Design a protein around this ligand. Structure first.
Ligand SMILES: COC(=O)c1ccccc1S(=O)(=O)NC(=O)Nc1nc(C)nc(OC)n1
Ligand SMILES: COC(=O)c1ccccc1S(=O)(=O)NC(=O)Nc1nc(C)nc(OC)n1
Ligand SMILES: COC(=O)c1ccccc1S(=O)(=O)NC(=O)Nc1nc(C)nc(OC)n1
Lengths: 349, 349
């Protein structure tokens, strides 16, 4: 289960831009100084790792971590079992894993001065936000409240510290610049499949509308829905009658229609309530978010698309959290991803 | 050359602590708030990646990136050639690569509020520092000034964008907590060899004094020298008559003496001047820093140690920058590391 034969592996940086400070650089003066003087900074670049099997079959897969995460989530589970990177190299696909701009090995754009500030220019905000352990517990549906598990949970219990340690903040890089980096990667790779998660769901949909090389999308528990501009359907508030899900992203119809040209599957785990749940905000949020996604997929299919929603319990998999690819049954989740790739000819040369 | 066979690979988090905000978490209230209310945060943890060959021989190697870097520098060179991770798995060692706390996939400790601030506590400073491309160019001895290359340079010229994109800022995490994370890793792995670089040089020396499982150290271009407390020798200022090298780190003699029990090699590349160089601050800084290291190694050897300084040009390798393990001749640099491991039996079971 653990062995991997790689024809090659490596990593590289792609995308980003530069910004410059005032003045000029003098090599005779002391170089280590609290100064942006004469300085060029590379910002907003992305880190990319690849592992290629011997005799690859089908298209390369690009695994794109969710919000506050890194490519670690595709390498191993919190309890140390193989992640989708190993499983899909064994399945004879070349596997790319990224750390998007602002996360992990991607660039965090800060300089000499208050965080994110280059002289009088704010590149990213000095004030950050970040989830807590308690917030992530309920966001990821480990259970209804921090420290409590659903009876059926597939989470690797006992490895809570390892799991939460993988999460962190993201600086306020524009989503446009994150999408731009991945479009550039897709141009470099050629035809490929995006496998996204949570926050990267909407971003991968956007990439596909800018990059014909994206030949398929599988999105685990996408966090933000997408619709044609001016065609957002009625979406109810949450059960508290005060809160809303994330405002759906709206794109020009000419771009939205490109989503009808490739197979797209959204995958949801377990324990999303069918009925309003005012006592558990994030459970209710997932109910309405999943509903919004069902309408988004319906809109793609009304344009001639092939967009599907897979609820893992309907496939016989019970208890999955919002990270099904690191849960205890992740091999069975991977099997369902292999099935999708195979049906759509994405595992053939 | 590119093929690699792994018995297993993976990644995990280790080390760190938790800090908490005020109050209690309520799962019925909107979870996504600009608030540290009832929040627990994991901070200062380290990311660790491992790749194990089939039938390893000798001790595992722990590659520890320099300042502002990540484990990427051991994965691949800027022009995409195999890094030391691949080369040493091929050489039958299990290889660990880390992103230390504050860098890459390691934790950046920030919350809801100004960067680094958890309510009234400053976990790390809101004001950051960061090198520029121009500063790094001269720091790493690509040439005497930005845009210029030393004759016979082994830098992968043409891949400057890739190279500089791998560098970034570090938040003000205490060095004690960075050392602590690696001590914990060394306890987890067992007997091992540390391979350090620039800023991580002094940190690896510190780890060895706290961790008997460190059985050898190879340090590329270490940035800060280390001496027994009260026993720092006279070190001259730089040629500009005003600047100094980094204040040497001082440790109690009982800990310093632990450095005499293991083989230690410091490795330097090319173009460090033998004579004062007022016009090029960082070249002169390297001259005096290397001198200080020569005295540190002598101090270890006078306590019965096995410490040595390897100047790559004396071994027949010309043109190396301060990242010799990513230069064009990195295979030959790796061969010298294999030689060190073999001399001391660190490549035998
Ligand atoms: C991996 O999960 C997602 O991708 C994900 C999944 C669902 C919603 C949102 C995200 S997120 O990551 O973009 N953003 C996020 O979680 N932010 C956040 N911020 C605060 C301040 N508190 C909390 O509490 C949960 N969350
Ligand atoms: C990888 O190199 C080292 O490890 C390394 C090598 C030699 C010295 C220092 C470092 S460092 O990385 O700890 N710190 C550093 O470089 N800081 C810095 N800060 C500013 C503000 N400007 C510049 O200009 C160079 N440098
Ligand atoms: C690393 O060295 C330098 O950086 C370096 C150092 C000094 C001069 C030039 C270079 S160079 O690399 O930019 N370019 C170079 O050498 N060009 C060159 N072109 C021809 C056509 N013939 C010869 O030499 C006969 N040289």
């Amino acid at each position: 289960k653990r062995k991997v034969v790689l024809a090659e592996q490596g990593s590289f940086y792609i995308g980003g831009r530069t910004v410059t400070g005032p003045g000029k650089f003098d090599p005779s003066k002391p170089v280590i100084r609290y100064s942006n003087e004469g300085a060029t900074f590379y910002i907003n670049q992305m880190y990319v790792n690849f592992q290629a099997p011997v005799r690859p079959r089908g298209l390369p897969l690009v695994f794109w971590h969710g919000g506050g995460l890194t490519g670690h989530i595709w390498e191993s589970t919190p309890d140390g079992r193989p992640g989708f990177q190993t499983l899909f190299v064994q399945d004879r696909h070349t596997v790319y894993t990224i750390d998007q701009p602002g996360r992990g090995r991607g660039n965090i754009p800060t300089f000499n001065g208050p965080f994110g500030q280059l002289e009088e220019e704010s590149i990213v905000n000095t004030v950050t936000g970040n989830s807590s352990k308690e917030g992530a517990w309920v966001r990821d549906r480990l259970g209804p409240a921090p420290g409590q598990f659903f009876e059926n949970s597939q989470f690797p219990r006992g490895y809570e510290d390892n799991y939460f340690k993988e999460m962190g903040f993201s600086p306020s890089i524009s989503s446009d610049e994150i999408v731009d980096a991945v479009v550039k990667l897709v141009t470099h790779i050629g035809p490929c499949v995006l496998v996204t998660h949570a926050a990267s769901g909407v971003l991968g949909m956007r990439v596909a509308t800018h990059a014909k090389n994206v030949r398929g999308i599988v999105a685990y528990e996408p966090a933000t829905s997408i619709f044609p501009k001016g065609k957002v359907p009625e979406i109810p508030p949450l059960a508290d009658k005060k809160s809303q899900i994330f405002p759906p992203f709206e794109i020009q119809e000419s771009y939205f229609k490109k989503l009808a040209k490739i197979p797209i599957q959204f995958v949801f785990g377990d324990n999303i309530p069918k009925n309003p749940k005012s006592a558990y905000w994030f459970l209710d949020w997932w109910r309405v978010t999943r509903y919004a996604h069902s309408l988004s997929l319906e809109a793609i299919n009304k344009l001639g698309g092939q967009a599907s929603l897979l609820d893992l319990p309907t496939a016989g998999l019970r208890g999955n959290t919002a990270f099904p690819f690191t849960d205890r049954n992740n091999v069975q989740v991977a099997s369902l991803l292999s099935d999708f790739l195979g049906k759509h000819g994405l595992d053939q040369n």
